[PDB]
Structures are given as C-alpha cells and as structure tokens.
Design a protein around this motif. Structure first.
Motif, mmCIF file in Angstrom:
data_model
loop_
_atom_site.group_PDB
_atom_site.id
_atom_site.type_symbol
_atom_site.label_atom_id
_atom_site.label_comp_id
_atom_site.label_asym_id
_atom_site.label_seq_id
_atom_site.Cartn_x
_atom_site.Cartn_y
_atom_site.Cartn_z
ATOM 1 N N UNK B 7 -64.947 85.869 -42.033
ATOM 2 C CA UNK B 7 -64.046 85.468 -40.967
ATOM 3 C C UNK B 7 -63.334 86.689 -40.405
ATOM 4 N N UNK B 10 -56.988 87.059 -39.937
ATOM 5 C CA UNK B 10 -56.300 85.924 -39.329
ATOM 6 C C UNK B 10 -54.840 86.203 -38.980
ATOM 7 N N UNK B 115 -58.552 79.082 -38.704
ATOM 8 C CA UNK B 115 -57.378 79.258 -39.542
ATOM 9 C C UNK B 115 -56.841 77.865 -39.814
ATOM 10 N N UNK B 116 -57.187 77.326 -40.979
ATOM 11 C CA UNK B 116 -56.769 75.980 -41.334
ATOM 12 C C UNK B 116 -55.290 75.993 -41.674
ATOM 13 N N UNK B 123 -53.370 77.770 -44.273
ATOM 14 C CA UNK B 123 -53.865 77.483 -45.611
ATOM 15 C C UNK B 123 -55.089 78.314 -45.967
ATOM 16 N N UNK B 124 -55.948 78.601 -45.004
ATOM 17 C CA UNK B 124 -57.179 79.290 -45.315
ATOM 18 C C UNK B 124 -57.904 79.670 -44.056
ATOM 19 N N UNK B 125 -58.849 80.571 -44.218
ATOM 20 C CA UNK B 125 -59.627 81.023 -43.085
ATOM 21 C C UNK B 125 -61.098 80.940 -43.453
ATOM 22 N N UNK B 126 -61.892 80.401 -42.546
ATOM 23 C CA UNK B 126 -63.318 80.403 -42.813
ATOM 24 C C UNK B 126 -64.026 80.509 -41.488
ATOM 25 N N UNK B 127 -65.313 80.868 -41.569
ATOM 26 C CA UNK B 127 -66.194 80.985 -40.416
ATOM 27 C C UNK B 127 -66.934 79.669 -40.196
#
Ligand SMILES: *[C@H](O)[C@H](C[C@@H]1CCNC1=O)NC(=O)[C@H](CC1CCCCC1)NC(=O)[C@@H](NC(=O)OCC1CC1)[C@@H](C)OC(C)(C)C
Ligand SMILES: *[C@H](O)[C@H](C[C@@H]1CCNC1=O)NC(=O)[C@H](CC1CCCCC1)NC(=O)[C@@H](NC(=O)OCC1CC1)[C@@H](C)OC(C)(C)C
Lengths: 306, 306
Positions: B7, B10, B115-116, B123-127
């Motif tokens: 990712x 963020x 960016x959840x 809370x979290x980052x993902x692709x």
C-alpha cells in the motif's frame, strides 16, 4: 466482511524517516527525539563490506561525516554511538513528529508492518511476519536499509525491525531497533543462508478462523484431534509445533466461532493431507501463515489507533 | 528482491480522517481544506435505509445535526451540500494537514490503497483493485463507511474511492470522491448484486513480469501467441480481454525482462490451461491480478513519496 493483509497506518512512522549518508553509502534512519537510528554498516565502504571491525571503523568517523537529511532540512550530528548493529546518531534537533513509541524485539511468528523507504522517503507499507528462521519475506531494494518494521497499539508505535540486508534466497534479515540481528545473521558479507523455514502453524489456524468468521466453512469437519496427533502431522508438513500456549491464544477465536481449537486442528490436518482440491480460503490457494491470532481479531473486529 | 501487496504510505490521508455523526449514524469523513466529505447515507435512519429521497432527507437537516469530530476537537458545520452520493459538510476550520490532493475516478483494473477507518481513526491500510464488476474486495466492518481509497503520486494524494456499502457476496461498493458510485450500485437498500467478475488479465501479466524480475522463471516457455489467440483463451477462463493498449502499457516490463508481451501471454495461456502443477509464483498458488503494471515497476524499482 473481507480479509486483507492489513498493515498498520504508517503516518506515525513516516514522520520519523530520514536519510543518512556517510561516505558513499546512503540509507534510511529512524529519527526519534534527538536520535537517528540506522544500520551501522552505513560506516562501511565498498572494500569495507567483507569482515569489518566496526569499532575500528567508527572511531575513525567524525560527526560531520554523517549527513542526515530530514526531508529538505539538514540535521547536524552532534554525537554518535554504536549499540550492537545499530548506529545512534545524536542530532541537535528533536523530531517534533516523534510518536509515542517503544522498541520491542518480537518472537518469530509475530507480524509487523514494514514502511519501505529510500533516501528517507517512504515508498510503501506492507505486512510481514518474522519467519521461524528469523528472516522476513520482505520487498526491499538497494537503499531500503534502515526501513523499519513496526506495530501500533492504540497510540504507541512499537518498532520491532530495522532492515539491514538481503540473503541470497531473496529473503531479508535485519535487527531490532537496539541493533540485535534477528537470527544468526551478522552484518558482514560472508556466507550466510537463511536456514530451513517452517510454517507458522498457530497463524494458519488463526487465518482458518478468519475464514470462518468471514463465511468460508468448506474445510471444517466432524473430526477432532489431539494436540500430539496434530503435531505429528504438522511435523511431516514442515509446520511449526503447536503448543498449548498457542491453543490458549486461539481461545477467543475459538469462542467467537464456536469451533474448538483442536477441531480446527483436525481441519488443518485434513487440509495438509488432502490439499484444498481446487478450492480457496480467503482468496488464497495456499494455507496462509502471516496473520497472527491478534491480527485476525483486530481486522475482524475493527480495532483502530488515535 | 521480494514482492508484496504494497500500500501507499497512509499518513497524508490519516491526517484527513474525521468522524461524522448525524442522528444514530456514525461514519468517517474526509477532511480536506474546510470541507468534510462523507457518504450521504449518513442522513438516513434505520427506517430511512430502504428507498430514501435524499434531497427530501437533506432539506430537513440543519448544520448542527452534523457532529464532526477531528480527533478530540469538535468541528462546526457551517453549511452542507450533496453532490451525487457524497455529502460535503462545510466546516469553519481548514484542515491544516490537508495534503496536495486530487479527486480521480479510476478505471476497473486500477489498484489503490484503502485506509480503513472507524470513528475517524485509521485502523489499517491495504491495497485493493477496482474489480471489473466495479466492486472491491475490501475488508470493511460496520462504521467503515467514508474510508477512502487513494493513490499517491510524488506528493499528491489522488483520492479515488469512498466506501459506502457491502454487497451480499461480501464485496464492497462505493463511490469516487465526487459521489458517483463505481458500477451500477445505488445507496439504497434494495436487491443489488455484484454481477459476474472477471480476472484483470493485464495485471496478471504484470505480476508474471514481477515474478521474472524477482527470479521466478519456471512458467516461461518457448511459445508465443497472437493477441487474438490469447484472447480466445482468456475468454474461456473468464479473463478480461487483453487490448493492444494493455500490451503497450506492459512495454517497459517487457523491455526490462526481455520477454515479449505476447511471449508472456503464451506463458499465461499455458498457466491457464495447465494450472501451476503444485508450484507457486511470488508466493501465490493463484494467478494474482491486483498489481497493475505501474505497481510492479514502482515496487521493483523503488519509487517513493515526499
Ligand atoms: C541496504 O540498503 C541494502 C538493502 C539490500 C539491497 C538489496 N535488497 C536489500 O534488502 N543492504 C545491503 O546492500 C547489504 C550491505 C551490507 C554490507 C555490510 C554487511 C551487511 C550488509 N548487503 C546485502 O543485503 C547483500 N547481501 C549480501 O551481501 O549477503 C551476503 C551474505 C551475507 C548474507 C545483497 C545486496 O546481495 C545479494 C542481493 C544477496 C546478492
Ligand atoms: C457503513 O459504515 C457500512 C459499511 C458496511 C457494513 C458492513 N461492511 C460494510 O462495508 N455500510 C452500510 O452498513 C450500508 C448502509 C447504507 C444504507 C443506505 C443505503 C446504502 C447502504 N449497508 C450495507 O453495506 C449493507 N448492505 C446492504 O444493505 O446491501 C443490500 C443490497 C443493497 C446492496 C450490509 C451491512 O448488509 C449485509 C452485510 C450485506 C447483509
């Protein structure tokens, strides 16, 4: 719903990355308060790579040999000290962006987010686990040394990894933030190999619980198993032994899904012995072992960070 | 070496997340300059979910109905306007953390970092990729609405996704930052299903190039193929058609690896027809389609962000 390899938000760490240049070597440093942490092999040259005496190498350094760039602002080194394999450059400016933070040496099986950086500029963030053989399957190019791995707990960044080197197998080795290598590795260019790795069994089970939380049930079964008979099967397939402590840790996930831990072990047993037979779990055709039980609970429940 | 679902960092987006509460609904908003962007279904109640007239619903709102929390600081709404399915809450304070940014509506096949967030706290980052059926295979729980997806280009955050809803299949639907849903979806609780998805062929090929860059070659072959004969095979396996434009885009990767695009297509053809036969590519036992050609070049070459 959904399950993703989720990294922690990286902003608290982005604010700490800096460029450290000494001689012909440029890498990243971690700027916390008035100290810049970076791999001590920054004080090595192209001939110094091989069998260096870093205490020798470092006494020959002066502070002005260390060029620390925080974005477009040159930081002045006012002192340096070596702690194991990390160099601590004392600078005259405290990082105003310093988060609440801890340095933690993690156990194998534990996961973390890596903020990959080049020239002090963050490039990407991804989740890694510390493999049982104390390497990490990272994504690192030249100049990524000094990139750190970390977890976040509410507001506190627990730094656990600093990147130092790539092994010939393409996996990565580094240190905790106090400069102690994970695994047998040393920061000197000699024959070093990863050593055989194993699958993080407790994490696979956690991810199987993630699957059930998210509606994959095809792999569950009637059967149960004893911890010993499971471990005898794990044994064969190069899986880390599952301990009672692992079982306990899988407690909440077992309680949330109503699937006894050893029942899930019976399910993993049959997955190991039958393959998945063209099916997928959480979008994977392999048994995934880089989610801890904590990872699953955090993402399947929504824990955040202020 | 190594290849990870990476990712973007963020932090530039973390600095924009805020909590928007209206009535019994809490979700996230995106605070850029003096505007807070959030899904317009924030103005809906538990009975209002079904077939709402949002223009009706919104004229019945007052600014003080909108409770915007930026951390522990209450933002005052001084005006509101609805643009498609996003609500734009005008606040009396410009976000000092506003990055350089653009709003971009991406094409399917394009990837982004999510960016959840919950309650305005990342809370979290993902692709993710935008699937061909305009859903995203996200990881989202109650309260994640208003989490945004984004890409970063040098210093500029290109926001491309705002999260609105989960479909019954567990995939996610949302809008661009101007409130236009990706796909046929509408923000009202009615029968909506994702529609059949397809594999992003050009991305699979990019990832096969990633594999070669990283030393997996077992899947390459002698053969070549024509674009038509490839597409006839893609066709069968529910793969998106590969266009000449796709081929051109795969140019640099072809040039870096010395593997003609259609040669790599011949390799993918045989992968589709033979499976992988117990082998893995870049640690995957499936053909991975959520890396764009840009993604591969960025991670295999080291592009960063200041
Ligand atoms: C720092 O930016 C850089 C990152 C690596 C480059 C490629 N991917 C990386 O993770 N680290 C290095 O280049 C180190 C240099 C120091 C020199 C002083 C001793 C510690 C390492 N070197 C490597 O990572 C090489 N690995 C290596 O030499 O291993 C030999 C055996 C000791 C393990 C890499 C660059 O070489 C290969 C890719 C393995 C050929
Ligand atoms: C906002 O925080 C929340 C996020 C979702 C909750 C679970 N995962 C999410 O991504 N979004 C919602 O709860 C929306 C509510 C609004 C109401 C007004 C219209 C737009 C959506 N609802 C959902 O995402 C539900 N999906 C849904 O109702 O779909 C019905 C068909 C229209 C598609 C979810 C919560 O319900 C199910 C999990 C699908 C049962």
């Amino acid at each position: 719903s959904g399950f993703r390899k989720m990294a922690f938000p990286s902003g608290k760490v982005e604010g700490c990355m800096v460029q450290v240049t000494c001689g012909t070597t440029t890498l990243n440093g971690l700027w916390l308060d008035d100290v810049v942490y970076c791999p001590r092999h920054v004080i090595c040259t192209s001939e110094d790579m091989l069998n260096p005496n870093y205490e020798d190498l470092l006494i020959r350094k002066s502070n002005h040999n260390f060029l620390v760039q925080a974005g477009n602002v040159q930081l002045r080194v006012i002192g340096h000290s070596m702690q194991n394999c990390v160099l601590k450059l004392k600078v005259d400016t405290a990082n105003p962006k310093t988060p609440k933070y801890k340095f933690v040496r993690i156990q194998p099986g534990q996961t973390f987010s890596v903020l990959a950086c080049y020239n002090g500029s963050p490039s990407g963030v991804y989740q890694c686990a510390m493999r049982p053989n104390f390497t990490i399957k990272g994504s690192f190019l030249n100049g990524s040394c000094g990139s750190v791995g970390f977890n976040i707990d509410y507001d506190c960044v627990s730094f656990c990894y600093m990147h130092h080197m790539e092994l010939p197998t393409g996996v990565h080795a580094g240190t905790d933030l106090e400069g102690n290598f994970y695994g047998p590795f040393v920061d000197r260019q000699t024959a070093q190999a990863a050593g055989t790795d194993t699958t993080i069994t407790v994490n696979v089970l956690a991810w199987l619980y993630a699957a059930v939380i998210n509606g994959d049930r095809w792999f569950l079964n009637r059967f149960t198993t004893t911890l010993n008979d499971f471990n005898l099967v794990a044994m064969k397939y190069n899986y880390e032994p599952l301990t009672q402590d692992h079982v306990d840790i899988l407690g909440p996930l077992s309680a949330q899904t109503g699937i006894a831990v050893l029942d899930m072990c019976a399910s993993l047993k049959e997955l190991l012995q039958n393959g998945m037979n063209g099916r997928t779990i959480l979008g994977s055709a392999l048994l995934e072992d880089e989610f801890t039980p904590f990872d699953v609970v955090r993402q399947c429940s929504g824990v955040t960070f202020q």
